[PDB]
Design a protein around this ligand. Structure first.
Ligand SMILES: [Cl-]
Ligand SMILES: [Cl-]
Ligand SMILES: [Mg+2]
Length: 172
């Protein structure tokens, strides 16, 4: 049911935060990343970042884009997680249902001491018995679609293979 999504996000948030402030950072950050990874659908998330060109890409191109984008996202935000590891989370008890009920958005209030709270919206769908997240928004801004313009400019100039090659170079 839709309420299961809220419960799972609450558990995910509790687990991630527990891992982060329970060990040395050098090992706790990798453990938190690895715990969180299978709860994201990076293929759907990459489709959202790339936009319309995603549908034209071959399977080999889609998979390469999703792999490199997952790595980019993890490098971009992993240290940021650790910075805010002492956060309060309050998950809005009711979720938002979209797309005929195939898409469940769970909202969470995240409180960093000294900071105004931010809405963190997780756009999920049911896969198996769990809910997997393919969009994350903070203060109403997606962390995912924010790449659409730049990825679009790279694709027009350099193609889907050019974007793949670009991401691979950014990931060092
Ligand atoms: Cl995935
Ligand atoms: Cl190909
Ligand atoms: Mg609550």
């Amino acid at each position: 049911s839709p309420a299961d999504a809220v419960g799972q996000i609450r558990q995910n948030a509790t687990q991630v935060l527990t891992i982060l402030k329970s060990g040395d950072a050098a090992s706790a950050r990798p453990k938190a990343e690895a715990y969180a990874v299978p709860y994201f659908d990076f293929q759907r998330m990459t489709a959202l970042a790339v936009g319309n060109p995603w549908r034209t890409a071959s399977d080999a191109q889609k998979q390469a884009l999703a792999k490199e984008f997952q790595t980019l996202l993890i490098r971009t935000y992993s240290g940021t997680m650790l910075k805010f590891k002492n956060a309060t989370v309050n998950v809005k008890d009711n979720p938002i249902v979209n797309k005929g009920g195939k898409e469940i958005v769970v909202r969470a209030e995240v409180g960093i001491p000294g900071q105004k709270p931010v809405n963190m919206d997780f756009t999920t769908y049911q896969s198996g018995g769990k809910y997997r997240t393919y969009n994350v928004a903070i203060e109403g801004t997606s962390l995912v679609t924010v790449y659409r313009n730049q990825f679009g400019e790279i694709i027009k100039a350099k193609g889907i293979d050019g974007l793949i090659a670009e991401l691979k170079a950014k990931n060092g």
